[model samples]
Target: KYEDLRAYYTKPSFEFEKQFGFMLKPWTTVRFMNVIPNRFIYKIALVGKDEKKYKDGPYDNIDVFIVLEDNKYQLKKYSVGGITKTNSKKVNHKVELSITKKDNQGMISRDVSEYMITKEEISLKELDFKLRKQLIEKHNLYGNMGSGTIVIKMKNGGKYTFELHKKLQEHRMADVIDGTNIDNIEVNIK
Candidate 1:
């Protein structure tokens, strides 16, 4: 039958590397824990780039810190320091905010002023749409340039700037995050 032939030829394959390139598997989970009413706790599953399958795949737990300031949401910090499944139990669960060694430091910083939505209660879907719109506008305005730079001014009269290359595929992660529901949602980093 034609249906049989189609099924045989269209069978699902697990070639993640070919389909998604070097990215996180789509099974990553995001948990928003309201353990404290005023504070927002986000648990993000950090999977290895090379991880192929979900079953027993190695991953680290990341806790994101966001605070409510005058009914506005602000990202304060995040920690990523946990053991992988292969090295579990023996290793203690530790959270590291930033790493510093010999004048070199590694940290995650983002300017959420434009993307942040001001409301008594935050809506993930709304925030997601805003971010998507912003990204699209930026891409349309600067996509032809191949890359763009963002400058941010700090409170201490310091300034920071970073360059970003335009890539639609790279923004796939935003789509994943936006499509997910609030509280506990699944994010697929393509």
Candidate 2:
């Protein structure tokens, strides 16, 4: 329908990420072979890993590791094996593990809260612990996560579902800039 808009959107990926109700921006994605321990983090890491290649479809495991306290947590640990989609090559590293009295708070508080990030909100802030903690708290921030983790697509422009179309239409409205005939379009598009 719109040539300029069409040229911007045709790709293997989709931009109408409405499926992910929390977030609406499309971010870049990266697939990793091995998950890194992340020596320093003031926040949390959205761990994305592929374990086995199922005949139906490969399964990707998404885990989030939040680092709270230092040595009180585990400094390091024995290797627990690594995974890839097709290859079963075992990877090794001294992992830091902790089943904290913190987990209880993590679970309970998480359920009661709302988030702006999703399976696809590829926030590569695993290394930005301080920033991650805030994003995890309110679920908002500038910058991109860039990890096509959610697997769904949409710019969340809210063409109709929310208010995107109306916002744009109003923006382009003839009298809008001048504040002329704003009454032509009621405050509520409803």
Candidate 3:
């Protein structure tokens, strides 16, 4: 099955877009969130010059890429190209990382660094809430700001850096067992 997989197919993104003679933006912001997804579906819609198209959706087989440490884990990835003549429309993939599945979706943006994280792993800091909350109180975090984000340096990698997606993923049921069809692609999480 390893031979059935290709490095070119596993690593998809703006990086892979550059390779294989595909078009890509030299600089684009990739949203970084570890969404313990509830439901995640891969999308590939492009009507390129010499490509195929249908009157409906453009989704070939979806290839996922998962990454982990010494022991291997399943991940997802896809090599899809999209095209549109709608003049002013956006064309891109909404890449998401899932940790949990259905009915419990805990998603976050990758760009944001600070969150109301547990004080255990991250260093805590906040504005005086008293400043914002005209409550007859003057506390450091509530002194000036009624509410503020606590800045935790994420000691030991802020366990919740999944602050993006660490809880159970929401894409579907958890596939903890190996040799599953979803456990084919490998990726780099770090």
For model 2, the run of ten residues with the poorest summed lDDT: 173-182
What is candidate 3's lDDT per residue for 98-154, written digit by digit as tens?
211112123321221111211111110011111112111222111222221211122
Score candidate 3 by lDDT: 0.20
Superposition error at 180 for model 3 (Å): 30
Candidate 1, residues 49-134, lDDT tens digits: the string is 21222233222331121212121343432211111112112322221111111111233233222222122222222232233334
| TM-scores of all predicted structures | 0.23, 0.15, 0.14
lDDT (CA) per prediction = 0.24, 0.21, 0.20
Error of 3 at 179 (Å): 31
Top candidate, metric lDDT = 1
Question: Higher-TM-score candidate among 1 and 3?
Answer: 1
Residue 66, model 2: Cα distance from true site in angstroms: 2.8
Point to the candidate with the largest TM-score.
1
Ranking by TM-score: 1, 2, 3
lDDT score, candidate 2, position 10: 22
Model 2 spans with C-alpha error above 4 angstroms: 1-34, 37-60, 72-74, 77-115, 120-190
Runs in model 3 with CA error above 4 Å?
15-81, 86-190
Which consecutive 10 residues in model 1 have the weakest lDDT in total? 13-22
